Design a protein around this ligand. Structure first.
Ligand SMILES: CC(=O)N[C@H]1[C@H]([C@H](O)[C@H](O)CO)O[C@](O)(C(=O)O)C[C@@H]1O
Length: 485
């Protein structure tokens, strides 16, 4: 009975993108969209298991290339309109259309066409068989065509979906407000009438909110505060793909030289970062994946701290007096890693580095997407979309979204080989493990964008106030199925 009760939560990530699922890659926007939008099939935020959302029943697989999905009876958008098969077609076609510049088409490269057969059934035709078809549907949220066509920017700021919570408002550095969608008839109806996410990127403010009872759960517990929070709260730390990456503009001298990119990895003392910033709750990367991922295989290139090796590579690359600027995001823990990275690099005999911090939204729109940068450290976690290896590789390495328009490595022979390998692993599934490891090993040698560390992710919540809350293995918070005591 969502009347008389509310949920308040502390979210760690500022709003850095809008909410249009065409482009909403910001951590806090994606988390909101788990509640505002539905796919045809969604993955549970905690268990990652698929469940029927806008699909009325299990997708009917006619053959390896053909699936039919029927819409849940009575499904409605938050404006009171029915969800239609045209809305489904529109949602997939806009992601697939290169002109629309989605951030996510590289997660559905196997879809050939989406067609409305009648007012209930949609036909999906695939380019080749893809066993994870249903699992990927969670990425393509179903949007109301009549709203989006009336103004994409307005929809991006005020999203309308079919999920159990309706968007009320979002105010930067303040809060996102949701309300129960009382016409939702899926599996996870809103258990409270109103939910407020306070945007508390400041570590201390976020912890204080939990301690004071201003919120019932907080994302991304600062490691230093975990012990004191345990007195009155549950604190649980979950193994995660979530990582800190080092990203180079590979078309700007001298970071177009792989030896320079390698050198800067070798120059970093990861154990010091882990001790000082993460309190042991992270591991230096030894592959693309974290070592607890089921598909982890250790990469053939390792970057254990070795200053002499860094110096040797720089001398081979002809570096005698390199001065560059590192851009970093503003996440409190990224701000803590940055000076330590700078100290390690400034200790090199031929490198001097300065630092600039920026909010993530401006970092991408004003610098990265234009190529107006040299080197970035930033956090990333595409495991929000799913946990399969093609997906995690594709986010950063399939197509153009990052390799062409962000880290600018798409003109290399190595990039083209990686594309062939990523395609082979999904078009020839019997060869996938071999093909993925070849791609990962090229990526790990070339280090265009590569993890420095993967981290354990702690969440805190009050079990006396919330029912059925569980922490995620990804960024965000989930209140699907969660109520108040
Ligand atoms: C799926 C994913 O990894 N999203 C990440 C995004 C994107 O890197 C950014 O929006 C550019 O697309 O940035 C963050 O929101 C951020 O830096 O605050 C972290 C988040 O984990």
């Amino acid at each position: 009975s969502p009347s008389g009760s509310t949920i308040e939560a502390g979210i760690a990530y500022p709003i850095s993108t809008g909410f249009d699922p065409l482009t909403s890659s910001g951590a806090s926007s994606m988390a909101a969209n788990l509640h505002i939008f539905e796919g045809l099939v969604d993955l549970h935020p905690v268990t990652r298991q698929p469940y029927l959302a806008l699909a009325a029943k299990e997708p009917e697989q006619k053959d390896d290339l053909t699936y039919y999905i029927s819409l849940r009876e009575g499904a409605m958008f938050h404006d009171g309109s029915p969800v239609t098969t045209e809305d489904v077609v529109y949602s997939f076609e806009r992601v697939l259309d290169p002109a629309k510049a989605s951030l996510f088409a590289q997660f559905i490269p196997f879809i050939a066409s989406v067609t409305a057969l009648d007012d209930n059934v949609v036909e999906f035709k695939l380019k080749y068989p893809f066993a994870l078809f249903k699992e990927r549907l969670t990425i393509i949220k179903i949007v109301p065509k009549h709203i989006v066509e009336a103004g994409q920017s307005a929809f991006d700021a005020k999203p309308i979906g079919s999920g159990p919570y309706k968007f009320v408002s979002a105010t930067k550095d303040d809060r996102i407000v949701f309300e129960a969608n009382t016409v939702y008839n899926g599996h996870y109806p809103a258990k409270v009438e109103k939910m407020t996410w306070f945007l508390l990127s400041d570590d201390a403010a976020r912890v204080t909110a939990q301690e004071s009872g201003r919120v019932q759960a907080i994302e991304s517990v600062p490691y230093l505060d975990a012990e004191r929070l345990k007195r009155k709260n549950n604190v649980e730390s979950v193994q995660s793909f979530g990582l800190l990456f080092l990203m180079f503009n590979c078309e700007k001298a001298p970071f177009d030289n792989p030896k320079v990119r390698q050198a800067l990895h070798y120059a970093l003392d990861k154990q010091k970062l882990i001790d000082i910033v993460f309190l042991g709750n992270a591991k230096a990367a030894t592959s693309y994946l974290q070592d607890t991922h089921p598909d982890y295989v250790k990469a053939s290139s390792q970057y254990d701290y070795d200053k002499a090796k860094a110096e040797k590579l720089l001398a081979e690359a002809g570096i005698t007096n390199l001065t560059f600027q590192l851009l970093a995001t503003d996440h409190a823990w990224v701000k803590e890693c940055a000076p330590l990275i700078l100290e390690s690099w400034n200790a090199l005999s031929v490198v001097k580095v300065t630092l600039q911090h920026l909010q993530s939204g401006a970092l991408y729109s004003a610098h990265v997407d234009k190529g107006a940068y040299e080197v970035v450290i930033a956090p990333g976690d595409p495991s929000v979309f799913g946990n399969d290896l093609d997906l995690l590789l594709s986010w950063w390495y399939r197509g153009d979204v990052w390799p062409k328009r962000r880290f600018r490595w798409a003109n290399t022979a190595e990039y083209h080989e990686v594309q062939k390998l990523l395609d082979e692993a999904i078009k020839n599934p019997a060869g996938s493990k071999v093909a993925w490891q070849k791609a990962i090993n090229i990526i790990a040698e070339q280090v265009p964008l590569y993890p420095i560390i993967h981290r354990k992710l702690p969440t805190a919540w009050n079990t006396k106030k919330l029912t059925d809350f569980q922490p995620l293995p990804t960024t965000g918070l989930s209140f699907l199925g969660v109520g108040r005591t």
